[PDB]
């Protein structure tokens, strides 16, 4: 995985270059955003269970998904699904802290679509649950950190559809 | 793996046959070559590191491969590549001693192309490096032993095609 600093360093190193003005500008911008990222991540760590709870209640409950015949039916499958939502939220928070989506591709989205297709997990319902997480997080953390968390949650959604 | 003696043994066994005149003739031919094979193996083992060093200097050093952005850039990748050249030389010596390429089919070329493609290792550059190893080994072990070792190194190269 790479964060924003490591991404800058990797581009420079692949050129064999010292860090010039533009690379330092990128580093400065990331440092400026660091405090906002840390505040948002602390809030999400505080309210992760609530965020998942509210996203599920908004998107999945009281539908065919939970009723007999749906994929969330049975306590086992319910637990597996909310576990997956917790995984996605945790990895989106990681990505927001790093300012890089790479951890999502190396750790989450690798083979995830094939996994859900072999399991029969409905993809659209999962995407809707993730988007509900995005809205809950936006209302909880603000509109700037909300926007960054939205970028990374939409990245997770893009790798699932 | 399967050497000349073992290949003869397999041919006789699958027919439930005792070794006849032709099989003994093949064994005697391999015995005749054994002295040359052992001599070449001794010399190569004594000089494997310098064979690799000269091959690298001939084919790889001071090119885009070792410059920033090249696949031999960074110390870990350079060490890995010279390790691969060590692999190829050692296993070619094994095949030369056995007088058979089956070891190459079993534990050198199996899935190697996929390995390098997944790693991003450049195939043409490694083929040229193996050719350089063949040339240096020939210059060290003389024309005949170089012809045999070249047969096995070229077997590896054709595998990478």
């Amino acid at each position: 995985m790479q964060d924003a600093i490591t991404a800058v360093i990797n581009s420079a190193d692949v050129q064999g270059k010292y860090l010039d003005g533009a690379a330092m500008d990128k580093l400065k911008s990331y440092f400026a955003s660091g405090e906002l990222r840390v505040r948002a991540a602390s809030v999400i760590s505080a309210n992760a269970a609530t965020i998942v709870k509210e996203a599920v209640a908004k998107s999945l409950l009281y539908s065919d998904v939970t009723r007999p015949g749906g994929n969330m039916y049975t306590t086992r499958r319910y637990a597996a699904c909310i576990r997956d939502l917790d995984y996605y939220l945790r990895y989106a928070t990681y990505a927001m802290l790093a300012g890089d989506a790479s951890i999502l591709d190396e750790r989450v989205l690798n083979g995830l679509k094939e996994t859900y297709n072999s399991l029969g997990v409905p993809i659209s319902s999962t995407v809707q649950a993730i988007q509900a997480i995005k809205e809950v997080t936006a209302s909880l953390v603000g509109a700037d950190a909300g926007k960054e968390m939205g970028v990374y949650l939409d990245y997770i959604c893009s790798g699932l559809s | 793996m399967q050497d000349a003696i073992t290949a003869v043994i397999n041919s006789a066994d699958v027919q439930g046959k005792y070794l006849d005149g032709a099989a003994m003739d093949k064994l005697k031919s391999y015995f005749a070559s054994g002295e040359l094979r052992v001599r070449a193996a001794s010399v190569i083992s004594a000089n494997a590191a310098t064979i690799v060093k000269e091959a690298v200097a001939k084919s790889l050093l001071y090119s885009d491969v070792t410059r920033p952005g090249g696949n031999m850039y960074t110390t870990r990748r350079y060490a890995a590549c010279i390790r691969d050249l060590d692999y190829y030389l050692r296993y070619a010596t094994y095949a030369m001693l056995a007088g058979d390429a089956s070891i190459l089919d079993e534990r050198v070329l199996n899935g190697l192309k996929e390995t390098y493609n997944s790693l991003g290792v450049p195939i043409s550059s490694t083929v040229q490096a193996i050719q350089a190893i063949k040339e240096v080994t020939a210059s060290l072990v003389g024309a005949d032993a170089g012809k045999e070792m070249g047969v096995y190194l070229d077997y590896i190269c054709s595998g990478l095609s």
Partner: peptide
């Protein structure tokens, strides 16, 4: 998002044009 820039492609060094 995880594919490195130097893997499996030619990395051209970028230099400012000499006329600058």
């Amino acid at each position: 998002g995880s594919l490195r820039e130097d893997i499996g492609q030619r990395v051209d060094k970028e230099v400012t044009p000499r006329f600058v």
